[PDB]
Design a protein around this ligand. Structure first.
Ligand SMILES: Cc1cc2nc3c(=O)[nH]c(=O)nc-3n(C[C@H](O)[C@H](O)[C@H](O)COP(=O)(O)O)c2cc1C
Ligand SMILES: Nc1ncnc2c1ncn2[C@@H]1O[C@H](COP(=O)(O)OP(=O)(O)O)[C@@H](O)[C@H]1O
Ligand code: SF4
Ligand code: SF4
Ligand code: SF4
Ligand code: SF4
Ligand code: FES
Ligand code: FES
Ligand SMILES: [Mg+2]
Ligand SMILES: [Zn+2]
Lengths: 99, 41, 258, 231, 225, 63, 59, 91, 441, 126, 217
């Protein structure tokens, strides 16, 4: 992580009614950041991304979904912490992710 | 994991004739005529 | 009396009757073991449950150690890792290379613990121990080179059943668990000996050389051969049925089947 | 003392009989009386020693089963005790069961030379028993008389110390004859060094009656007074 | 003989979480939502102050602060709707990052490249000739081939691995030569060296596999007569 | 159903699906899959990196 | 290293080298190997049925 | 010598024996039992014998050790990976 | 200045048989004197007297005997009796002191056992003797019979009215039986396999009852210090140490013997005065392993100024153990000596715990290969690490005892091992390394 | 900088782009990339090559080993790996599943049930 | 890294397993990529806290292999790092010591008298030559002879070791050692006879009895 990184807090500064839940991990690239976005704001958020100055040069690399209903920690169940992203998989029917 | 770098630029190898690893025939005047065509919109 | 202890810096409360292993299991942190059994007596032979306590220089056997107020247990520490690795290396030293031919290939807690806690490579390059096989009847197949001398078999025979035949005869690395004389282990509960034995030294002879654990589908059902009724697990590879086992039902089955 | 299980021998089968003599029964009664009435399980070792004394210095399997029956304990426990303790010969041995110590003190003193001399005289190798049932050689651990090394023990009973390439041969010949010296073969005493005593040279004090009397009542009173003062 | 530390004690699997409250919420709204301040007590300045004090004491952060947790960067400056200077500070930080991230790149961005373009022009039959680097690549390859050829010619021959059927004997050399010969005879082996003396010489001996020699120059066998 | 079959099978047995995905960059597909696996494991393939195979053969596959 | 047609080897004595450990069956990505094993009358751990579906197997 | 007799079962580990060794030709689809039965008992001086099923590591089966110091002297012991039977050279 | 103990200040009189070892000679030399008054004093006075005298265990532990005795329960509401085990088992290499009191002054041992039992409130005292000491066991049994006949022990011990029975358990050959828990199990009749020690056998030991295991030397010296005062014994040793101890020299010395001497005597003075020094002189000395085989070795560099004290030996890195001194000369091979010690430990391992039961054999094999010379430099560090893995991972402290000598050899004579390995490899070229296991020796 | 995945970031090669986004520019880019892969391969192979050699003091000429494998070739793939990760290389080349219990267990587990991977989400690209 | 302390556990020198594998591999790749003393010194100083003796020896090998000229940047930046690491070496750093010394000798760095003094003290004064492989020892002696640096004591030690291990001599190592000793003019008739016929008999090689009496380790 010996690079210059900044959180994409512009989205949550502009959409002032949303709460921020962001992650970065060494499992990903140094410049990769995950965030939680509500569905009812997803379209407006993409509208802002597609035409904001610094986010103008943005390309949708990937998009898919995960059937989180049947997600279970098969090993190291006790090691789970409340800050982990896996906590949002349990009891949720689906999880659609864009990159 | 990563490392820290102080000089981003990789300087060109020494061009002095006296220095070792000097190639007198690297550039060919007949072939390396790029400059003539480089300025072409 | 409720007592506060720390597991990896996590506060927890347990009564003084609890042991370190029991407190760890209740709080959800797993500790490897080879000789400790819930329904058998407490023994500290294998010493695979060694953990680190801040105020205790020596490693503490979790299975046979009671909790103390203010205890600081570090199960994720480098010292605990080294302890597990040393014990696993000692266990695997003299252990025969019989994974392909042993019937417990997929159900070997020794393999699992060696993969998860012990080191990945061995240093022992010497002649291993060799032990003659024993005939315990048509129900139990014995390959004593794989024995780890954890005495679970002896404890089960003496405690769960009334038969008193198995014992650790000998001293040192030449010690051999089993009957001194050549006789068959013909107790009505001889099947459970295979289940308690964790290293495939004793196996199900009728089921020997039949299948592997990863290719079986299990169903929970109830026994009918006895009017008592027993909670059993039936494992099948397609149409064929094999390896009927017990399952925990303390009210009626108490983990054992005939 | 080789295998950790029953060796298949025709002369040690279950059919071999064994019965304690009345003297052995009286000794067993005395041993049981010494031990707690309920804890009869503690008399395995004395019973095994009695069996060895009665037999030709070895414990038959039938004798082990008889001991277990008399002690009302599992035969497997007797088997475990006999296999764990190496002084019990589970198989017949020779007329002379030579036991040469091989620990570092004896090794420094020259245990290997004594062992080679014994092997040469007995025409047999270490561990192996002689063709005729007369000699049985074994290597054992520290027997206790390290200062008198090298040393050997016969029949787990008689210890012979300060052996050499010729003293050992003389001792073996004496044992074969029947009469032999007991203890070190040199001129030294029990623990007195070969050169001589370095302590207890004062014969007068040792010979004269030695008395040490203390006023125990006065000491107790002083202790109580000091304790009260501390209180 | 050093098996400890075979497993990597230090790993590159580490994650950091950053959670903030909505920037739109005011201090009063935040207190009401968290429950420290009652909905109707917002008017009472004393009640609001008491609720703020309790919130600061219990949650270890001021009500104005918007940062629930910032493991990613541990920033101590929250961005909130009330403090308009926070927006300007964040904008300055964003532009600083925009400059510095591009500056630290080695190949992705280069103003020198933008203002002094370097082009590859196809102008000859051999595309390698148009680039000085590719000509040097060709020369280096030929130089390596010539060096290898010179070394091999000077050596004069080439060792090679030769298959040996005796490598597949039933028994290992650690066994007795008599046992090895007996097993081979029992399995009917007649193409292996079963000499007792040879087996004794090889007993408990570790040595490399059979080797042969390819002798230069390489030429075709011919029947000229 | 390559993704479905990969989910059904363990990690190692799903690798050849990545060879099948691209008929001319199978080495690169394998490299991506292995890179993801080792990123999850938290380690790196020092052996491959020092042997240079994963770069020279990637470039050969590019050719 | 070429992988062509599957085959089962034997020891130089003529005994089968295959012991029914099913490691190959489990590792087969295409589920092309089917193994059933029963103890041999002499007592060896040897397979009674070892099938490879060449049409289902990826080499 | 009835294969189903108690004595035969006890000697053969409670498995029905085939003296002719011909049933394996169909049961296990090979004559390997007949082929291996031809090799005689290998007599080894030591009490413990090491078997690798070949001349070098990785050319046979995993290195295994067999105890030739049987509770009954001279009893041959068969390797589990290969059918080779070793016995101690009692003298 | 420590050493040169007066002949009239030696507790173990008649160490060299000069008088009758039976009751007649015992009473002549002063045994069984004022035992009735000693008992009448009371257990608390006896415990306090031991604590003041500072007597500490003569075994490997060296723990305070007074505190060890005081740890015993005052009274058992359930009616459980208390047991006094005397661990006469002497199986550690180089140790001979224990057997030199059984056959010389058994009555002193019996009197000490009676005094300690009365102090501890114990009905029965069991003397566990290794089976090798057959003659000494017979002599002690005869002494016990004489004591019973004279009324010293049994009903109304010495007329005090305190019933006390002394029994003798002649065990068999097992060095592991010397361990407290192993000793208790051997008495019980099971295998001499030690037991984990959370129950503190002083609370639940023999037959589930409170039992205390004590050394023969400590038991024998207790009554003498009781009669002569605590100050007398406390003034014959360096501060924090007990006093006069019974040393025994076994190795390459001119006059090997067992002698009683004042505590803290210099090792060089002890070797030169009582035993005549090394065979070829002090310059010919190669090493000394004082205090039994279990503790590490000491080279001649440190042997010069080392004092025979628990604290001094612990600071130097080679504990005092059982005051068994084996002197290794320049003629012997330290590698061979430690190889034999490792073989002894491998033979004597009970086998209950995998660390010990496997590492002992592993160390024996590694030491054998090192002695042959067919070993690598890295194998020395591997052996060091293996010993460090064995130690503290076992149950009975026998793994640590087996590990310590190897560590001492590795730290002291590393150059010797390296030179031997180089000498072997010089004459035995080997380009290829076999993947097979090392050949059995 | 943040997305390199192999030795590429430490090799001096060139990537090509066109000012026209047409099929002709794409074809030229593909040809140039094919040509530059040769340079990258050459650099990669040189990274594992022992170009220099011992030079005699008296004669100032190379001293070539007659009976050593390194004389046949100037490229040694295991050079850097052996130089840096000596312990790992020794363990890899000395311990296998035919002689080490731990290696056998690892092999058995690896081929029965694949290696255990800690729970988590990753996205890796090439 | 975050919450990371790079102080060695041994308290003497850092070890590769202490660092993350990614850091070790990336620093090694950077060292391999360095093609000049200036840039190599910059990289080493920037990542000094992660630097390891293995990687330092590998950097020296890379410089020697590619014949990167030794210049003022080397002598002013790299040399102090080499001195510090060599001083901190111990028995287990025999590989790094031998490699660094051999490649410095081959590169023929005729300066850094302090560096050469430190290397000599480690090699002979601390008796670390006994942990150097025979072939590595011969190469080290040849490299130091090429650099012209060395001590009569070290050369006598090398000669005695060669005589001791004459049986293990390979023809290539024999040629290298003979060239080194002939160039230096140091040697003995016994040494030359051993080099000519390593497998000769004791009576064939006169003086071996005296050498055995000396008993060189
Ligand atoms: C393996 C082992 C062997 C022992 N052997 C003996 C022994 O032979 N004799 C002995 O007196 N103590 C021996 N001990 C020590 C005893 O367990 C115990 O510490 C001592 O006898 C108690 O007396 P003390 O408190 O006076 O030392 C041994 C300990 C261990 C771990
Ligand atoms: N056959 C070889 N195989 C792999 N690496 C080698 C080989 N020979 C030399 N190396 C490398 O060369 C360097 C030593 O250089 P040098 O002394 O010239 O080689 P050598 O002594 O084998 O002739 C080391 O990095 C060493 O790993
Ligand atoms: S118990 Fe069986 S599967 Fe487990 S290691 Fe031992 S032989 Fe292999
Ligand atoms: S046979 Fe199995 S259960 Fe019995 S002691 Fe050995 S490993 Fe334990
Ligand atoms: S079942 Fe498969 S893996 Fe196992 S031995 Fe037979 S062929 Fe090999
Ligand atoms: S350390 Fe050794 S002697 Fe002590 S209990 Fe464990 S196996 Fe038995
Ligand atoms: S589970 Fe703790 S000792 Fe076995
Ligand atoms: S060394 Fe012989 S009795 Fe101790
Ligand atoms: Mg070299
Ligand atoms: Zn085999």
């Amino acid at each position: 992580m010996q690079n210059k990184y900044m959180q994409p807090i512009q989205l949550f500064i502009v959409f002032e009614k949303l709460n921020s839940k962001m992650w970065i991990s060494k499992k990903l690239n140094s410049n990769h950041s995950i965030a939680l976005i509500p569905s009812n704001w997803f379209y407006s958020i993409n509208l802002f991304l597609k035409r904001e100055l610094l986010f103008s040069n943005i390309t949708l690399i990937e998009n898919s979904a995960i059937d989180t209903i049947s997600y279970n920690l098969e090993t190291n169940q006790n090691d789970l912490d409340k800050t982990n992203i896996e906590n949002y998989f349990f009891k949720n029917k689906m999880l659609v992710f864009y990159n | 994991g990563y490392i820290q770098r102080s000089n981003i630029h990789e300087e060109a190898p020494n061009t002095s004739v006296e220095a070792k690893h000097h190639n007198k025939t690297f550039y060919d005047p007949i072939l390396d005529i790029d400059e003539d065509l480089k300025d072409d919109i | 009396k409720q007592i506060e202890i720390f597991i990896d810096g996590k506060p927890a409360k347990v009564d003084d009757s609890y042991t370190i292993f029991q407190a760890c299991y209740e709080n959800g942190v797993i500790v490897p073991r080879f000789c400790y059994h819930e329904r058998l007596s407490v023994a500290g032979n294998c010493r695979m449950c060694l953990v680190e306590v801040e105020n205790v220089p020596k490693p503490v056997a979790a299975c046979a150690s009671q909790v103390v107020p203010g205890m600081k247990i570090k199960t994720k520490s480098e010292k605990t890792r080294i302890h597990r690795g040393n014990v696993m290396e000692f266990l695997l030293a003299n252990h025969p290379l019989d994974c392909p031919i042993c019937d417990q290939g997929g159900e070997c807690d020794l393999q699992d613990i060696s993969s998860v806690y012990g080191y990945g490579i061995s240093r022992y390059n010497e002649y291993k121990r060799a032990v003659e096989d024993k005939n315990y009847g048509p129900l139990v197949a014995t390959s004593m080179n794989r024995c780890i001398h954890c005495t679970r078999c002896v404890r089960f025979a003496t405690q769960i059943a009334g038969v008193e035949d198995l014992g650790k005869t000998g001293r040192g690395k030449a010690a051999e668990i089993g009957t001194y004389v050549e006789k068959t282990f013909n107790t009505e509960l001889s099947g459970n000996v295979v289940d308690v034995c964790p290293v495939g030294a004793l196996t199900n002879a009728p089921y020997a050389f039949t299948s592997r654990p990863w290719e079986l589908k299990s169903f929970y059902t109830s026994d009918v051969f006895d009017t008592l009724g027993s909670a059993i697990q039936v494992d099948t590879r397609g149409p064929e049925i094999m390896r009927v086992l017990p399952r925990i039902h303390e009210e009626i089955n108490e983990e054992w089947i005939s | 003392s080789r295998l950790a299980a029953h060796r298949k021998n025709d002369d040690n089968s279950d059919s071999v009989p064994f019965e304690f003599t009345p003297e052995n029964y009286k000794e067993i009664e005395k041993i049981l009386a010494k031990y707690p009435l309920k804890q009869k399980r503690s008399a395995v070792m004395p019973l095994l020693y009695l069996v060895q004394e009665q037999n030709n210095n070895w414990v038959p399997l039938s004798a082990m089963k008889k001991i277990a029956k008399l002690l009302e304990m599992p035969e497997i426990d007797v088997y475990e005790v006999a296999t764990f303790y190496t002084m019990y010969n589970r198989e017949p041995v020779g007329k002379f069961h030579l036991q040469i110590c091989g620990t570092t003190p004896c090794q420094l003193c020259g245990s290997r030379e004594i062992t080679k001399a014994i092997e040469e005289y007995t025409q047999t190798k270490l561990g192996h028993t002689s063709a005729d049932g007369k000699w049985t050689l074994e290597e054992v651990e520290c027997l206790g008389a390290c200062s008198n090394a090298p040393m050997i023990q016969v029949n787990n009973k008689w210890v012979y110390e300060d052996l050499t390439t010729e003293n050992v041969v003389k001792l073996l010949k004496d044992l074969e004859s029947g009469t032999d010296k007991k203890g070190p073969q040199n001129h030294r005493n029990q623990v007195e060094g070969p050169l001589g005593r370095s302590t207890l040279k004062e014969k007068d004090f040792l010979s004269g009656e030695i008395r040490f009397s203390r006023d125990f009542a006065k000491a107790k009173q002083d202790w109580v007074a000091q304790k009260e003062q501390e209180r | 003989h050093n098996i400890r530390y075979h497993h990597e004690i230090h790993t590159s699997d580490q994650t950091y979480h950053s959670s903030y409250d909505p920037v739109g919420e005011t201090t009063t709204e935040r207190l009401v939502r968290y429950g420290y301040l009652n909905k109707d007590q917002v008017n009472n300045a004393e009640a609001v102050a008491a609720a703020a004090k309790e919130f600061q004491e219990k949650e270890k952060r001021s009500p104005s602060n918007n940062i629930i947790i910032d493991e990613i960067s541990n920033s101590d400056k929250p961005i909130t709707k009330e403090n308009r200077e926070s927006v300007a500070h964040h904008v300055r930080q964003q532009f600083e990052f925009f400059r510095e991230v591009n500056a630290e790149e080695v190949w992705s961005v280069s103003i020198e490249e933008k203002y002094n373009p370097e082009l590859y022009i196809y102008k000859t039959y051999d595309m390698a000739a148009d680039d000085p680097v590719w000509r040097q690549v060709k020369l280096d390859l030929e130089w390596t081939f010539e060096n290898i050829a010179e070394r091999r010619e000077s050596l004069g021959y080439m060792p090679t691995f030769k298959g040996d059927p005796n490598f597949w004997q039933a028994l290992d050399n650690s066994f007795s030569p008599e046992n090895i010969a007996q097993v081979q005879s029992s399995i009917g082996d007649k193409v292996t060296n079963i000499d007792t003396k040879a087996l004794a010489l090889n007993h408990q001996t570790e040595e490399y596999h059979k080797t042969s020699k390819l002798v230069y120059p390489i030429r075709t066998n011919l029947v000229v007569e | 159903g390559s993704e479905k079959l990969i989910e059904d099978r363990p990690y190692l047995q799903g690798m050849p699906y990545f060879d099948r995905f691209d008929y001319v960059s199978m080495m690169v597909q394998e490299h991506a899959y292995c890179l993801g696996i080792e990123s999850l494991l938290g380690t790196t393939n020092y052996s491959a990196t020092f042997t240079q195979i994963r770069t020279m053969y990637d470039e050969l596959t590019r050719i | 290293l070429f992988r062509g047609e599957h085959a089962l080897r034997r020891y130089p004595t003529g005994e089968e080298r295959c012991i029914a450990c099913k490691l190959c069956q489990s590792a087969c990505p295409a589920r092309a190997i089917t193994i059933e094993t029963e103890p041999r009358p002499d007592g060896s751990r040897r397979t009674v049925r070892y099938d490879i579906d060449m049409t289902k197997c990826i080499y | 010598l009835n294969p189903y007799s108690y004595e035969a079962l006890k000697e053969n580990h409670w498995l029905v024996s085939d003296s002719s060794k011909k049933n394996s030709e169909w049961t296990h689809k090979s004559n390997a039992e007949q082929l291996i039965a031809k090799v005689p008992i290998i007599y080894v001086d030591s009490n413990i014998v090491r078997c690798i099923g070949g001349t070098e590591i990785n050319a046979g089966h995993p290195q295994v050790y067999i105890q030739l110091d049987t509770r009954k002297h001279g009893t041959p012991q068969t390797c589990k990976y290969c059918g080779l039977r070793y016995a101690k050279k009692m003298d | 200045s420590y050493g040169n103990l007066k002949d009239q200040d030696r507790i173990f009189t008649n160490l060299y048989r000069d008088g009758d070892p039976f009751v007649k000679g015992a009473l002549k030399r002063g045994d069984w004197h004022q035992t009735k008054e000693i008992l009448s004093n009371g257990p608390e006075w006896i415990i306090d007297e031991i604590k003041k005298s500072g007597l500490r265990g003569r075994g490997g532990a060296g723990f305070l005997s007074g505190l060890k005795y005081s740890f015993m329960p005052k009274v058992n509401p359930d009616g459980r009796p208390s047991y006094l085990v005397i661990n006469s088992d002497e199986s550690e290499p180089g140790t001979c002191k224990d057997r030199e009191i059984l056959r010389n002054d058994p009555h002193k041992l019996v009197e000490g056992a009676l005094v300690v039992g009365f102090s501890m409130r114990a009905r029965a005292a069991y003397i566990y003797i290794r089976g090798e000491f057959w003659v000494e066991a017979n002599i002690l049994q005869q002494a016990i019979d004489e004591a019973y006949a004279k009324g010293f022990i049994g009903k109304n011990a010495c007329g005090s009215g305190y019933d006390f029975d002394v029994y003798i358990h002649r065990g068999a050959g097992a060095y592991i039986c010397g361990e407290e828990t192993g000793l208790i199990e051997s008495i019980e009749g099971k295998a001499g396999q030690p037991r984990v020690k959370p129950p503190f056998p002083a609370n639940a030991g023999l037959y589930g009852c409170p039992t205390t295991v004590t050394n023969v030397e400590t038991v024998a010296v207790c009554p003498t210090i009781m009669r002569r005062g605590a100050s007398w014994f406390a003034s014959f040793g360096r501060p924090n140490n007990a006093g006069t101890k019974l040393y025994c020299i076994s190795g390459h010395v001119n006059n090997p013997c067992t002698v009683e001497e004042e505590m803290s005597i210099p090792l060089r003075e002890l070797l030169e005065k009582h035993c005549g020094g090394v065979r070829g002189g002090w310059d010919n000395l190669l090493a000394v392993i004082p205090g039994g085989s279990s503790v590490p070795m000491m080279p001649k560099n440190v042997c010069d100024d080392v004092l025979m004290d628990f604290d001094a030996l612990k600071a130097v890195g080679s504990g005092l153990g059982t005051a068994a001194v084996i002197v290794m000369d320049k003629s012997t091979d330290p590698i061979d000596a430690i190889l034999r010690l490792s073989k002894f430990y491998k033979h004597e391992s009970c086998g209950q715990c995998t660390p010990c039961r496997e590492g002992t054999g592993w160390i024996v094999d590694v030491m054998e290969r090192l002695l042959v010379g067919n070993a690598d430099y890295a194998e020395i560090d591997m052996l060091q690490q293996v010993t460090q893995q064995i130690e503290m991972h076992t149950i009975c402290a026998l793994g640590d005892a087996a590990a310590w000598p190897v560590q001492g050899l590795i730290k002291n004579f590393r150059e010797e091992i390296e030179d031997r390995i180089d000498s072997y490899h010089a004459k035995h070229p080997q380009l290829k390394k076999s993947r097979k296991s090392n050949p059995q020796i | 900088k943040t997305e390199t995945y192999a030795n590429y970031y430490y090799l001096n090669f060139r990537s090509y782009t066109g000012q026209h986004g047409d099929c002709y520019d794409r074809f030229l880019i593909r040809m140039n990339e094919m040509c530059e892969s040769l340079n990258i391969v050459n650099q990669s192979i040189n990274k594992i090559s022992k170009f220099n050699n011992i030079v005699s003091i008296n004669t100032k000429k190379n001293i070539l080993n007659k009976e050593n494998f390194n004389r046949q070739t100037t490229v040694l793939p295991h050079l850097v790996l052996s130089y840096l990760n000596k312990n790992d290389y020794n363990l890899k080349n000395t311990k296998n599943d035919y002689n080490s219990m731990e290696e056998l267990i690892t092999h058995f587990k690896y081929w029965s049930k694949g290696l255990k991977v800690e729970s988590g989400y990753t996205y890796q690209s090439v | 890294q975050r919450g990371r302390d790079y102080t060695p556990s041994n308290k003497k020198y850092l070890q590769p397993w202490e660092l993350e594998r990614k850091e070790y591999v990336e620093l090694s790749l950077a060292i391999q990529s360095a093609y000049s003393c200036k840039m190599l010194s910059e990289i080493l100083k920037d990542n000094l806290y992660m630097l390891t003796d293995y990687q330092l020896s590998f950097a020296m090998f890379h410089l020697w292999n590619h014949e990167i000229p030794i210049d003022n940047y080397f002598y002013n930046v790299i040399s102090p790092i080499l001195k510090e690491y060599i001083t901190r070496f111990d028995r287990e750093c025999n590989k790094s010591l031998a490699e660094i010394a051999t490649f410095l000798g081959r590169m023929n760095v005729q300066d850094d008298a302090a560096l050469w003094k430190v290397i000599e003290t480690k090699l002979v004064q601390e008796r670390l030559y006994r942990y150097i492989p025979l072939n590595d020892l011969i190469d080290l002696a040849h490299g130091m002879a090429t650099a012209n640096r060395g001590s009569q004591e070290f050369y006598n030690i090398v000669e005695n070791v060669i005589i001791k291990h004459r049986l293990r001599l390979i023809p290539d190592k024999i040629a290298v050692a003979k060239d080194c000793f002939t160039a230096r003019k140091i040697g003995s008739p016994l040494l030359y006879q051993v080099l000519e016929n390593p497998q000769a008999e004791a009576h064939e090689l006169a003086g071996l009895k005296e050498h055995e009496q000396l008993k060189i380790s």
